[PDB]
Amino acid sequence: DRVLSLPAVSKNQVLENVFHTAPKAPVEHLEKMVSANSKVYDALNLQSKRVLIWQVKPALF
Amino acid sequence: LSNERYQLLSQWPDFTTMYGKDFYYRAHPEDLKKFYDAADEYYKLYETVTEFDSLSALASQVVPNYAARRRSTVHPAIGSTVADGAFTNFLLSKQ
């Protein structure tokens, strides 16, 4: 019964209690806000090819 | 109206200042999964409030019901306050 003197908690159960959650990448905040601010650029810039300024305030000609 | 909702996603606390592993390992494993879910939620809210190419098709859900109320058989500009004021003239005169 030498196995009953070994630590009963497995090496697996250490690696799933220490590494419980997949950690958040540093770059996943950049490349997720950048793709969402690229829609703020598109709609709201005045130099974009798809501005909403002629759709929401139609021009007086 | 999207600007009034974007202004309150402007005032969201920077959760990415707590992504380091000295916050990962000091924190309860369930309060860290809630924190990583509250950060995934902000990207859900922010990527849909900046979907401004969807506002032009939401405006077409307001137009056809408004335009049918203007196709009134009485007048385009009729309302209740005028049509009640013209019932007072109709009722409180002789027959």
User: Which residues in chain B touch residue A50, judged by CB atoms under 8 angstroms apart?
Assistant: 53
Give B6→chain A minimum CA distance, Å.
11
Nearest Cβ partner for A32 among B36, B43, B52:
B43
Secondary structure (3-state) at A43: helix
Whose tokens are 């770059």? That residue is A27
Q: Are B15 and B35 in contact (CB under 8 A)?
A: yes
Give CA separation, B40 vs A25, B3, B34, B37, in Å.
Answer: 12, 21, 10, 5
Q: Are B58 and A55 in contact (CB under 8 A)?
A: no
Experimental method: cryo-EM
Token pair for B52? 């401004």
Query: Does the beta carbon of B31 lie under 8 angstroms from any beta carbon of chain A?
Result: no
The Cα B48–Cα B42 span in angstroms is 10
